[PDB]
Amino acid sequence: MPLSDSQIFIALFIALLTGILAVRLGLELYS
Amino acid sequence: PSWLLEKPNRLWELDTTWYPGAEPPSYLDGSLPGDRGFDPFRLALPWLVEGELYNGRVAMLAVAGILLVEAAGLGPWWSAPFRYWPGVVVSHAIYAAFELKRFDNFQKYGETGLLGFVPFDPLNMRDDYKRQSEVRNGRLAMLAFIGFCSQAANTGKGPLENLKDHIADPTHNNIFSSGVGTEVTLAVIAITTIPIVLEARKQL
Amino acid sequence: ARGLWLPDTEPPAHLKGELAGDRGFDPLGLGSEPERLKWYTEAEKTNGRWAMAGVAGILGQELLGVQPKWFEAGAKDYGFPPLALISLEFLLLGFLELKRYQGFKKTGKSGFLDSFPFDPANLDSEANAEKEIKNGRLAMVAFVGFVGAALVCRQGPIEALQSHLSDPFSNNIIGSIARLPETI
Amino acid sequence: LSDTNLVIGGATVASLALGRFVFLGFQRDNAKKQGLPQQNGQSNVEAGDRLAEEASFALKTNDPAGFNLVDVMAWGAIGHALGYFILATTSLNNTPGFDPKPF
Amino acid sequence: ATKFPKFSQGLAKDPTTRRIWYGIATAHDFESHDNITEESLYQKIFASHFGQLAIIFLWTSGNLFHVAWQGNFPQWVQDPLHVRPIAHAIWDPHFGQPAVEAFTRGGAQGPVNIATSGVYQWWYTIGLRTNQDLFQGSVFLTILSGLFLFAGWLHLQPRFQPALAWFKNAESRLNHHLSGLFGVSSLAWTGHLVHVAIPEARGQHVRWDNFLTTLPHPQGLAPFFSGNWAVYAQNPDSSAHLFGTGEGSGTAILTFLGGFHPQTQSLWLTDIAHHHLAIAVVFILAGHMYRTNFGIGHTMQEILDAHTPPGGGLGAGHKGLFDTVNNSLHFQLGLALASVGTITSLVAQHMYSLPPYAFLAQDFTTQASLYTHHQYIAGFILCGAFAHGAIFFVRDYDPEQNKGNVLARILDHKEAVISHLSWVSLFLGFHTLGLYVHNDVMQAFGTPEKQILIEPVFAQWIQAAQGKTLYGFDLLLSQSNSAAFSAGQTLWLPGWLDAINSNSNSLFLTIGPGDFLVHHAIALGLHTTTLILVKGALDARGSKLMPDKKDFGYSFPCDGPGRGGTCDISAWDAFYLAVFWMLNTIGWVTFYFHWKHLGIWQGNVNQFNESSTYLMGWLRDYLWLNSSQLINGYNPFGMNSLSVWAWMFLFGHLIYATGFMFLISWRGYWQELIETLAWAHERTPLANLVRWRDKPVALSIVQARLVGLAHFSAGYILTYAAFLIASTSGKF
Amino acid sequence: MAAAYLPSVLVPLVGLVFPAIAMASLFLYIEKE
Amino acid sequence: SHAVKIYDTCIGCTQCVRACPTDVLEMVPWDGCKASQIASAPRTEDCVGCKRCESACPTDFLSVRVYLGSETTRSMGLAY
Numbered sequence A: 001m002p003l004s005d006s007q008i009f010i011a012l013f014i015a016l017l018t019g020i021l022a023v024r025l026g027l028e029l030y031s
Numbered sequence B: 001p002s003w004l005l006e007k008p009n010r011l012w013e014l015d016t017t018w019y020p021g022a023e024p025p026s027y028l029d030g031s032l033p034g035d036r037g038f039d040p041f042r043l044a045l046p047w048l049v050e051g052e053l054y055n056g057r058v059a060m061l062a063v064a065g066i067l068l069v070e071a072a073g074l075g076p077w078w079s080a081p082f083r084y085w086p087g088v089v090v091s092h093a094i095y096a097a098f099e100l101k102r103f104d105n106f107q108k109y110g111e112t113g114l115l116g117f118v119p120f121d122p123l124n125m126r127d128d129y130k131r132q133s134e135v136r137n138g139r140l141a142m143l144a145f146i147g148f149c150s151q152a153a154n155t156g157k158g159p160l161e162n163l164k165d166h167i168a169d170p171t172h173n174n175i176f177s178s179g180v181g182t183e184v185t186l187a188v189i190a191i192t193t194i195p196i197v198l199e200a201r202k203q204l
Numbered sequence C: 001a002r003g004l005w006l007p008d009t010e011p012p013a014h015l016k017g018e019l020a021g022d023r024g025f026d027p028l029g030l031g032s033e034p035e036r037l038k039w040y041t042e043a044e045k046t047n048g049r050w051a052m053a054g055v056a057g058i059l060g061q062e063l064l065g066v067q068p069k070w071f072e073a074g075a076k077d078y079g080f081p082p083l084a085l086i087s088l089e090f091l092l093l094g095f096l097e098l099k100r101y102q103g104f105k106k107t108g109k110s111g112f113l114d115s116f117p118f119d120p121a122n123l124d125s126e127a128n129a130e131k132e133i134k135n136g137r138l139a140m141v142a143f144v145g146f147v148g149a150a151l152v153c154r155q156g157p158i159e160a161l162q163s164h165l166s167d168p169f170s171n172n173i174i175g176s177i178a179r180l181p182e183t184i
Numbered sequence D: 001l002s003d004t005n006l007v008i009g010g011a012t013v014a015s016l017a018l019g020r021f022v023f024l025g026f027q028r029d030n031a032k033k034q035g036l037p038q039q040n041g042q043s044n045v046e047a048g049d050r051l052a053e054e055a056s057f058a059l060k061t062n063d064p065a066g067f068n069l070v071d072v073m074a075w076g077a078i079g080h081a082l083g084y085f086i087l088a089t090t091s092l093n094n095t096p097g098f099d100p101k102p103f
Numbered sequence E: 001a002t003k004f005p006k007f008s009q010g011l012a013k014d015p016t017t018r019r020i021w022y023g024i025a026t027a028h029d030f031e032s033h034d035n036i037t038e039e040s041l042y043q044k045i046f047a048s049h050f051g052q053l054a055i056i057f058l059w060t061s062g063n064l065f066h067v068a069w070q071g072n073f074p075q076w077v078q079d080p081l082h083v084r085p086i087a088h089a090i091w092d093p094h095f096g097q098p099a100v101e102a103f104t105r106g107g108a109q110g111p112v113n114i115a116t117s118g119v120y121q122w123w124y125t126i127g128l129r130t131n132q133d134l135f136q137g138s139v140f141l142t143i144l145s146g147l148f149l150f151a152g153w154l155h156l157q158p159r160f161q162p163a164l165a166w167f168k169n170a171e172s173r174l175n176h177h178l179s180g181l182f183g184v185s186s187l188a189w190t191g192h193l194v195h196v197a198i199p200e201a202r203g204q205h206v207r208w209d210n211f212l213t214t215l216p217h218p219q220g221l222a223p224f225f226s227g228n229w230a231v232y233a234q235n236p237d238s239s240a241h242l243f244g245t246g247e248g249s250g251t252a253i254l255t256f257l258g259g260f261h262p263q264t265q266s267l268w269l270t271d272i273a274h275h276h277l278a279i280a281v282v283f284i285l286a287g288h289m290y291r292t293n294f295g296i297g298h299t300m301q302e303i304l305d306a307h308t309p310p311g312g313g314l315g316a317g318h319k320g321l322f323d324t325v326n327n328s329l330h331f332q333l334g335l336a337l338a339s340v341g342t343i344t345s346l347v348a349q350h351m352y353s354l355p356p357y358a359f360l361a362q363d364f365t366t367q368a369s370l371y372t373h374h375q376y377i378a379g380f381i382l383c384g385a386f387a388h389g390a391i392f393f394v395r396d397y398d399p400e401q402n403k404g405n406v407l408a409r410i411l412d413h414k415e416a417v418i419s420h421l422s423w424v425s426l427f428l429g430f431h432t433l434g435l436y437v438h439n440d441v442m443q444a445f446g447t448p449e450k451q452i453l454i455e456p457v458f459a460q461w462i463q464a465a466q467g468k469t470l471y472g473f474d475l476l477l478s479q480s481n482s483a484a485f486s487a488g489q490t491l492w493l494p495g496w497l498d499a500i501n502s503n504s505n506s507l508f509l510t511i512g513p514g515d516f517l518v519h520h521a522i523a524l525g526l527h528t529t530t531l532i533l534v535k536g537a538l539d540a541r542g543s544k545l546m547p548d549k550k551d552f553g554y555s556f557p558c559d560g561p562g563r564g565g566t567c568d569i570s571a572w573d574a575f576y577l578a579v580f581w582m583l584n585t586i587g588w589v590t591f592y593f594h595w596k597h598l599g600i601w602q603g604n605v606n607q608f609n610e611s612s613t614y615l616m617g618w619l620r621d622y623l624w625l626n627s628s629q630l631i632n633g634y635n636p637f638g639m640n641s642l643s644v645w646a647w648m649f650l651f652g653h654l655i656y657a658t659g660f661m662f663l664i665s666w667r668g669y670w671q672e673l674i675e676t677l678a679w680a681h682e683r684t685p686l687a688n689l690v691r692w693r694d695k696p697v698a699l700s701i702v703q704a705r706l707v708g709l710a711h712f713s714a715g716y717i718l719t720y721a722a723f724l725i726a727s728t729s730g731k732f
Numbered sequence F: 001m002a003a004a005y006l007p008s009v010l011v012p013l014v015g016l017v018f019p020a021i022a023m024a025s026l027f028l029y030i031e032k033e
Numbered sequence G: 001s002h003a004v005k006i007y008d009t010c011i012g013c014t015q016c017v018r019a020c021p022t023d024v025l026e027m028v029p030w031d032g033c034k035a036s037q038i039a040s041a042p043r044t045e046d047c048v049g050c051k052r053c054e055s056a057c058p059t060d061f062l063s064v065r066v067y068l069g070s071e072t073t074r075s076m077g078l079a080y
């Protein structure tokens, strides 16, 4: 049984939040 | 800039700023109408003020026309323009003639106006209350047009029928039972958890 | 000399007895830093208060005979779908907890929204603080006991107590672990 | 008083007694010579590690020989491990089909 | 001048293009950055470690997500021997229609890549069955990555910044890592195996919504608490068990059967559960060794200071080594890399011979890819271990603080160590090459019976002692009346002896003279790579040619043409030279693994046994013979799905060759050439309207060695990966 | 696959749009005085 | 710029000064050696780092040492 469109969008949104946290860590490590 | 308020004043709708205890940016000091210190991605300035106003003003007419069309039985609003090349050219020429003066006024006055009535107001009555009401109604109108489009995408019925279905069954006819339910729930959780992360930034 | 968790031991130097519930118990030394100690004091109060509300909720739900048990109440049909429920709950609790943190940052005390402290009946006292913290600790321990009874005996708290009172030499933790194949 | 009760309780009691009466001096003087963990000639708490402060409950006990709570947990852990080793080896050797002996 | 290398004002004031390159290459050498302190260095490293952990968990989440979204995991679960596992989908707008058709495989609706990573076998073994399971795991790991990123940001904030002394508390970190990070994690994994993976192997669907309802064993936890632990070993899965179904299944959860499940050709899951449980208990016990805040436990400085032989054979012994190790991040990283890389090699050697995942042994491409992947990773890590040992000797070693201990004493006889490594390398090279060349000449002259074929009787004796009866040595596990035999006879010996005496698996393969010769080649490679690395580390502080080398640091171009000339004199250059030898060594190892297994998988062991004793046999019957399908991936007649590997094969050859340019031609040629080019641009009309900001210069001497080595290594790896995967997957 | 249009959007984004943005921004950062 | 430090084993032979192609080095009076002079490096801003001076030096080990440092237009030997 395949995944739904909503599951892919959920994963992409959680990854976008994780990427925001990553940018935050990278900027903190920089300065 | 007549869109600037007579006096700097941040209004109160359950709080002053977009979450309780939120700091305001240095460039948002309450001089603008609808100021809530809300620019977390620091996009902001005055060109974006006419951008917000223009999008809001077009959205007022959009939501008014859609609600009036749905109030009568004039079919779906999204299929309405389909119910060509000379017309496209003449409309684009007329609207571009409008936008010529709209863009020219910003180079000199810092405002847009309509043609040369840069404070376009033949009947006066302009005040800070009118400015704040205009910006808040524009924001509400463009949120309402996005709601119209999203409700027409998720359900084939018009916005009046969606309101009737929500009236009939409130807990079962809402966004959290539609196709976009789980991602909306996740966005709500992220939204409600974001300001505590921002306060962790502040206190640390 | 206040009572200590162990008789005739030296408490850590950061526990001199000013806070309510200070029995010198910090064997790991978690509260050695003062600001973290204040935050942990508020956190102990908030966890204990949520435990008191929840333990009273589980007890009242079993006392009033609500048909699904407390550990199966989420799966019940209420008409309201759980996605809408969790979204509205997160909105309301986000408002209330942002207000509570703003009050803790401004004043350093507990309280409801724009009221720090929250005491309209004016019942605040040092003995009352000791009663609050001791009932909170007892309710936290009690909630862990509720989880244990729900996990091993598959029973609510009053049901497990009645089972223990009916036969205490076979209806204890030893017997319930020995009866996991028939329970589960 | 089952076989589990007998083996676990007897091993725990024997370990606690061995730690209390027999090996207390040996453990005490070895822990005295080895001392606190160090870094660059200083204990960890003196070097600036506040989380490495010696736990105040761990020394003073009221036992006349100085047997504290940490000694009870350590020797009881040893006793439980020995008792469960005995019980497990007995369980293996009593189950038919299993024979770990080299002959 | 500029602000990009903001950690180095010396680089920021460089007016040439060297500023950009060196700004990239020195960014993670935090100790050499401007105004760094020890405490801020440790805090930056801690946060960087959080970032790396988040990257790892995101990478795993991406693999799970792409398999769940675009793979064929349920179809593979239905037929694990007849379904090619899909890695991910291909969306390439440069594809022609024949390429679209060729890459559509595995039952996919479009072009896909077939996975070689073995994640299907692993995830299926641990109990995952559906796309929903993989998706939920991927979402959980994305959240874990976000948590790690938040913790990395958090511990950089001033009130959550750990003090320097916290980082140097060795005893508490060792206690916690051994007891919790190793032991409790292994215990929790035993919980997962017992509650989920073992029932799913027996057809029982156990997930989060029903695992509190499902009994892992019919008698519950009473045998555990009573100590009647042999109950959990009763009634194992039978030899006729079908994996993932209840047919032929048992009820045991902790066993010691040994050997393999007959259908999956992999280790029994109940054996794996008992392994991880025993590991959990041993590691939790070992995590109570060191003293923290409770008055008990060992002090490592006193342990080290106590271990000095009273006869004086080791001088001062290990005195002062606690502060030497604890104050040097390079000593710690060198130890960590040496141990982890050796463990990576152990993983490679044990996963092919004792496959732990169901239907992994039958997937030949995956087994070859995993062995090669982990052995090359192990080689790079071992090179890094010795590199950071050399860096320790330059940057962190204090001779006064280590006076007379084992470190100073091994520095004091470095000539003996290096010269003996040179002797063993020379002996192995002379005699291994000589025996191979003698055999090649014997084959060329038509007389293969004149070859020198030395039987590996020592390793055959080892195989006999572990129970392989083929060689006729009757001892220990191959002697039916021995004490070692009788002790294991009721526990693990029946399954182990069934597995080790079968030639249909990879458990202790039959070996002969070809295995002898290639093992001595492997010994030559290990000893020579070690010689280069050890000579680099021990001469890092100085040699007779440059007695003050420590003053110049780990990496510097040379000391000029004086004193005879001093190219490649730095310890860094010894690392650079040793990477070539490591790649050569892992090449020999993996060539051996692949060719021997190719013969075994094709059912013709005589090809390796007869052709591997001479080097033309390797060339013709391994490289030339098995490249035929690969290089026909595209041809004038058309293309197939191996065309990506043919293209990558050539791509690797090209990158390898490009590296030779940086390695052979050196700097001053290019600098004069670039000078003429800079003249040309300034004098060319319509082009001299634009100017460079950074003055173009040739790459530096060290940078050239690095870039040439990087191209050489990348081409090496890409070429062999294409050949390995294409040759194995075109047949299997 | 579900949402099968997503590769046709994200592959040009990750392969062309993001690298162009990245090298333009990084060029502007590393040349800034 | 590169750092050129002089040590006290210098015998004042002047060979490093003669070898230098960018006039970094010069001889100054000294009392530590028989020649009554010592090499000095006052103009290391012009030092290219060729180590011709070290090749010229006769003492064992060297009495002039060049430590390559931060690179400049002058030290990179650029005419453009």
Ligand code: CLA
Binding pocket: A025, A026, A027, A029, A030, E004, E005, E006, E007, E023, E024, E025, E027, E028, E044, E048, E049, E051, E052, E055, F029
């Ligand atoms: C495991 C991966 C990893 C981790 C944990 C780090 C961690 C760090 N790096 Mg390293 N980096 C990596 C991979 C990594 N990097 C790779 C593959 C390269 C190319 C070889 C680099 C090249 C690099 C440079 C050139 C610099 C860092 C710097 C940093 C620090 C700040 C990063 C940041 O986001 O600033 C965010 C800052 C901005 C977005 C604006 C400035 C732009 C900076 C100067 C360059 C971009 C840095 C970024 C990490 C490049 C990513 C490379 C990409 C191909 C993966 C931090 C300690 C910087 C630091 O100051 O040194 C301690 C620094 O100058 N990194």
Ligand code: CLA
Binding pocket: E306, E307, E308, E309, E310, E311, E312, E313, E314, E317
């Ligand atoms: C007869 C009694 C006896 C014996 C046989 C030993 C034996 C040993 N003791 Mg002593 N010891 C004794 C009595 C004894 N002890 C007594 C009564 C005490 C008082 C309690 C001690 C207290 C003591 C301490 C405190 C320590 C020892 C240690 C040692 C070890 C090293 C000693 C040494 O000097 O190495 C000399 C070694 C060298 C000079 C280096 C040789 C290096 C070779 C040449 C390298 C070869 C590499 C090879 C070529 C490459 C791989 C080969 C390839 C085939 C794989 C050794 C196992 C030490 C230790 O190791 O403990 C585990 C240690 O710390 N002992």
Ligand code: CLA
Binding pocket: E422, E423, E425, E426, E427, E428, E429, E430, E433, E524, E528, E531, E532, E577, E578, E580, E581
């Ligand atoms: C096929 C390529 C090749 C060969 C044969 C060698 C050979 C050798 N390497 Mg060199 N290496 C290579 C590639 C090679 N290397 C590359 C690409 C690099 C990267 C730059 C290195 C970097 C390197 C380092 C850094 C070191 C070596 C060392 C060694 C020696 C290893 C010990 C040994 O095997 O002794 C046996 C010797 C040989 C196999 C050489 C050939 C002997 C011939 C066949 C003898 C017979 C000659 C014949 C009769 C004469 C006829 C002449 C005719 C005109 C009459 C050996 C001399 C190590 C060393 O010197 O240890 C002592 C050392 O430290 N290598």
Ligand code: CLA
Binding pocket: E093, E094, F011, F012, F014, F015, F016, F017, F020
């Ligand atoms: C992941 C990266 C990626 C992607 C998605 C593409 C996609 C494409 N490439 Mg390939 N390319 C890439 C990387 C990529 N390229 C790299 C790294 C190289 C060098 C190795 C090449 C070398 C290459 C060549 C030599 C050619 C392509 C061509 C094409 C097109 C073939 C399909 C077609 O028939 O279009 C037909 C073309 C059209 C229908 C017109 C498309 C016009 C686009 C949409 C204009 C977009 C505006 C532009 C991107 C503005 C940039 C702004 C800012 C982001 C910088 C397609 C647009 C072929 C071509 O057609 O492109 C010109 C072509 O000749 N590529």
Ligand SMILES: CC1=C[C@H](O)CC(C)(C)[C@H]1/C=C/C(C)=C/C=C/C(C)=C/C=C/C=C(C)/C=C/C=C(C)/C=C/C1=C(C)C[C@H](O)CC1(C)C
Binding pocket: C025, C026, C027, C028, C029, C030, C047, C048, C050, C051, C053, C054, C055, C057, C058, C061, C069, C070, C071, C072, C073, C074, C140, C141, C143, C144
């Ligand atoms: C201090 C010290 C210090 C040192 O140093 C160290 C150490 C030792 C670590 C420490 C100790 C400690 C302690 C033990 C802690 C623990 C805790 C817990 C118990 C809490 C909770 C807490 C808990 C709480 C929150 C809670 C509760 C919950 C609630 C809300 C809910 C409920 C319920 C309801 C009603 C009903 C339904 O039907 C269901 C539910 C929904 C389910």
Ligand SMILES: CC1=C(/C=C/C(C)=C/C=C/C(C)=C/C=C/C=C(C)/C=C/C=C(C)/C=C/C2=C(C)CCCC2(C)C)C(C)(C)CCC1
Binding pocket: D012, D016, D072, D073, D074, D075, D076, D077, D078, D080, D081, D084, E281
């Ligand atoms: C006071 C007093 C006394 C005493 C007595 C008592 C009271 C005692 C008790 C004590 C005890 C009674 C103790 C105990 C302890 C125990 C412990 C502490 C345990 C632990 C355990 C463990 C650690 C386990 C583990 C494990 C597991 C879990 C699983 C399996 C494996 C093993 C076994 C390892 C006398 C009379 C002398 C005198 C007078 C007074």
Ligand SMILES: CCCCCCCCCCCCO[C@@H]1O[C@H](CO)[C@@H](O[C@H]2O[C@H](CO)[C@@H](O)[C@H](O)[C@H]2O)[C@H](O)[C@H]1O
Binding pocket: C001, C002, C003, C004, C126, C127, C130
């Ligand atoms: C397994 C063995 C079990 C033995 C344990 C049970 C016996 C002991 C239980 C009696 C405990 C009485 O606990 C007692 O609590 C009171 C408050 O409640 C503490 O009293 C403290 O707070 C009160 C209340 O503000 C103030 O008067 C004052 O600051 C201080 O005395 C005592 O310091 C403690 O001794």
